[PDB]
Design a protein around this nucleic acid. Structure first.
Ligand SMILES: Nc1ncnc2c1ncn2[C@@H]1O[C@H](COP(=O)(O)OP(=O)(O)OP(=O)(O)O)C[C@H]1O
Ligand SMILES: O=c1ccn([C@@H]2O[C@H](COP(=O)(O)O)[C@@H](O)[C@H]2O)c(=O)[nH]1
Ligand SMILES: [Ca+2]
Ligand SMILES: [Ca+2]
Lengths: 445, 288
RNA sequence: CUUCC
RNA sequence: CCUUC
């Protein structure tokens, strides 16, 4: 029947006694893949080649094969697994390449002072050029795909201060899973390079397409459409950026990561730019009260070290007095469950946690290590991130924050480069490193 | 007539606030695979709302036929989520599960060596355990135990991060010995046997700190009593305030479960989302 | 396991 | 075969 037909028209041969039963399932997937014009594709990667990859060592008849060459392995692949594997990927091209990729081809300096200043208060511490081409694609992307891809990180600030030295166009997108598969092929084709796409068990919803030699091409974070909305999004240049305010809160939350302080005692200027480009945004946007004078900041944080859980007194700001900042996600989760709460607000890889307010109290998990100024003494640069974190929530929920943030900022203006006594050992996140080998035909998560 | 106004269904067992003496005198189609579709859509949904479910491997032991499971699979796939689905069961699985690259189908039965194997195999991917192990008419406490005994082993072995374990206290009058089951919230199941005391033991793990709760017959009485109350008095009530097409307690209950489920597609009110899910769900098993 | 915006 | 349903 019409079924066996499709399997041979696809297998470029007769299906074995078994092969039938297996693929039998992959109906239209396999059928569609076939009665799908390859040519048009062959020319679309071409039409792209010259635009973001004009500078490549490839030819029209050379590339053309690759494309076909791939849609031709059904006939040589005899491993039901590898077979199933190449079919799921051929299908990604088939339905999304057009929609997701093909479409493509159709004042501040002021705070430079404060930047250095707030930065200093702290300071107490101790990649293949395809990067380029891609960084050229991504630009158009954010433009085309406003609502299915939002950006941040280094890049973004350069869109508010073209005087910002960035390296990676960082993003959050509702389809990252596809987005990378596609691009993967894009590069795998035009380049002729055998890339790899991996998921890093550590980061939540994270897949970075690296290079044939581990040359970080570009990484991405996936987020529910749900979350995609609540994110403080901003418009400028027909692309959405993560509202710089928010982006500055993580800024603060980042620096509670010792690791990143052994990074501060390095590029004191690197951050010195992104920094003020932010202090500048808000100050101008929400007229941030910038006078060293600032009360009720860095709420008294109490780190029970036996439970590996902090205790912040947001009181002077939000209905809830305490905010139990957990340091063992897997714990918070169970206890949360114990709280019989099943509607905790999760904002995926954004806040890197799920905030909860059972009985007028806030429970949360801090994705970083905690800084100590002394034994049991929570170094201040901690109450820095600790706060922000909360605020992030406040922001993804739209609540009385402006006040606190402005307040928080002022507390950063010129301060003791306080010694760092110790720091917490961030909970290990489990999971095997999964990857996709377009080339070796291996899919694993 | 036999109605009621509630604030929320009894989600977990610790929440039933009354008892009733079990009296042995003791409603859909394809409802079996439904009771499950929810408890599972629910369990994993949380694991996702808390992250755990991220790129992890769900090891479903006691799955088959497991028709529903497909649904679940399609749900999360459609959600961008990444998960390997390992279904092990001596009996076979609803063919609608073959050909799935994201699903492995073991046609074997579990024991000591076996877990030690798959564990080694799967490691270090984080594991999510879903046991629905069985053993006609209704399992004798003799079996109930051996099963639970076995479930407590999977746990210790596959050392999972979270687990949804079958859990129905062994009838008092038929009690044998005590035992421990892992700590964890116990969710009541919607569209479940008129008078069942089954409930999934949802439990998330600490790491090097496993926890079990000693089970006693006194404990067992509480169940029959409380549970029976639920099945006879609670479920058979009508939530007159609940603004939903169907108003039976269960539909009300089923609501509160889905309310927490995730779904990208944009939706107006929640009733909007839930309702759709429900629809789509019943759709799948094919129930009017 | 290491592999971490 | 220039964005494949
Ligand atoms: N601990 C954290 N938790 C959640 N998000 C974080 C954390 N630390 C940093 N981030 C986010 O990562 C974003 C950018 O990563 P990063 O590369 O380190 O700085 P950048 O501005 O992108 O400069 P470059 O990308 O190195 O050129 C900025 C911040 O919102
Ligand atoms: O989804 C999979 C899993 C494994 N393999 C590869 O196929 C070979 C035999 O695996 P089997 O199929 O499990 C190995 O190279 C393995 O890495 C695939 O092609 N696809
Ligand atoms: Ca970055
Ligand atoms: Ca990055």
């Amino acid at each position: 029947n019409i079924t066996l037909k499709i399997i041979e028209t696809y297998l470029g041969r007769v299906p074995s006694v078994n092969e039938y039963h297996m693929l039998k399932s992959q109906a239209r997937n396999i059928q569609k893949i076939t009665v799908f014009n390859k040519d048009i594709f062959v020319s679309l990667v071409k039409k792209n080649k010259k635009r973001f990859f004009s500078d490549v060592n490839t030819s029209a008849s050379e590339i053309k094969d690759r494309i076909l060459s791939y849609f031709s392995k059904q006939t040589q692949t005899y491993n039901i697994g590898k077979l199933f594997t190449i079919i799921e990927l051929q299908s990604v091209l088939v339905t999304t390449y057009t929609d997701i990729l093909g479409v493509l081809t159709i004042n501040v300096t002021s705070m430079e002072e404060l930047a250095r200043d707030m930065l200093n208060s702290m300071n107490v511490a101790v990649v293949s050029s395809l990067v380029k081409n891609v960084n050229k694609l991504m630009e158009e992307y954010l433009r085309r795909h406003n609502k299915s891809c939002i950006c941040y990180g280094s890049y973004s600030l350069y869109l508010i201060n073209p005087n910002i030295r960035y390296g990676d166009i960082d993003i959050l997108q509702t389809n990252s899973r596809t987005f990378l598969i596609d691009l993967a092929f894009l590069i795998k084709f035009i380049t002729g390079n055998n890339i790899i796409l991996s998921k890093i068990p550590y980061l939540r919803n994270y897949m970075v397409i690296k290079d044939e030699n581990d040359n970080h091409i570009i990484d991405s974070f996936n987020i529910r459409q749900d979350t995609m909305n609540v994110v403080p999004k901003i418009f400028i240049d027909n692309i959405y950026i993560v509202d710089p305010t928010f982006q500055l809160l993580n800024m603060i939350k980042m620096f509670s990561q010792i690791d990143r302080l052994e990074d501060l005692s390095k590029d004191p200027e690197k951050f010195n730019a992104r920094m003020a480009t932010m202090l500048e945004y808000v100050r101008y946007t929400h007229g941030i009260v910038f006078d060293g004078k600032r009360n009720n900041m860095p709420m008294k944080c109490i780190i029970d070290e036996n439970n590996r859980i902090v205790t912040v007194t947001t009181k002077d700001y939000f209905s809830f007095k305490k905010c139990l900042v957990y340091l063992d996600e897997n714990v918070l989760s169970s206890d949360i469950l114990d709280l019989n709460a099943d509607t905790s607000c999760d904002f995926e890889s954004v806040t890197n946690s799920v905030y909860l307010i059972h009985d007028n109290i806030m429970y949360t998990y801090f994705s970083n290590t905690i800084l100590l100024s002394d034994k049991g003494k929570v170094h201040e640069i901690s109450a820095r991130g600790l706060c922000a974190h909360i605020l992030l929530y406040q922001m993804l929920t739209s609540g009385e924050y402006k006040q606190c943030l402005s307040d928080l900022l002022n507390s950063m203006m010129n301060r003791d480069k306080i010694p760092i006594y110790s720091h917490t050992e961030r909970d290990k996140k489990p999971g095997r490193h999964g990857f996709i080998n377009i080339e070796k035909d291996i899919i694993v998560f | 007539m036999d109605v009621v106004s509630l604030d929320k269904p009894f989600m977990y067992f610790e929440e039933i606030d009354n008892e009733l003496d079990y009296e042995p005198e003791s409603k859909l189609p394809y409802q079996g695979q439904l009771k499950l579709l929810l408890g599972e859509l629910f369990f994993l949904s949380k694991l996702q709302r808390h992250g755990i479910l991220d790129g992890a491997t769900v090891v479903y032991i006691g799955s088959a036929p497991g028709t529903h499971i497909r649904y679940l699979r399609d749900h999360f796939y459609n959600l961008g989520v990444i998960i390997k689905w390992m279904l092990i069961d001596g009996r076979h699985h609803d063919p609608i599960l073959n050909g799935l690259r994201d699903v492995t189908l073991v046609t074997r039965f579990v024991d000591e060596e076996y877990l030690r194997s798959i564990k080694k195999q799967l490691h270090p991917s984080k594991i999510i355990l879903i046991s629905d192990v069985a053993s006609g008419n209704e399992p004798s406490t003799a079996d109930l135990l051996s099963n639970y005994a076995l479930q407590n082993v999977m746990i210790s072995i596959l050392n999972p991060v979270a687990s949804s374990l079958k859990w129905r206290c062994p009838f008092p009058d038929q009690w044998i010995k005590d035992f421990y089951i892992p700590h964890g919230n116990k969710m009541l199941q919607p569209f479940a046997p008129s008078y069942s005391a089954e409930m999934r033991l949802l439990s998330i793990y600490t790491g090097e700190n496993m926890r079990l709760t000693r089970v006693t017959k006194s404990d067992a009485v509480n169940y029959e009593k409380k549970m029976y109350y639920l099945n006879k008095i609670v479920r058979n009530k009508v939530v007159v305030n609940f603004d939903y097409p169907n108003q039976e307690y269960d539909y009300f209950h089923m609501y509160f479960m889905l309310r927490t489920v995730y779904c990208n597609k944009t939706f107006p009110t929640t009733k909007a989302k839930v309702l759709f899910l429900q629809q789509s769900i019943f759709r799948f098993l094919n129930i009017p």
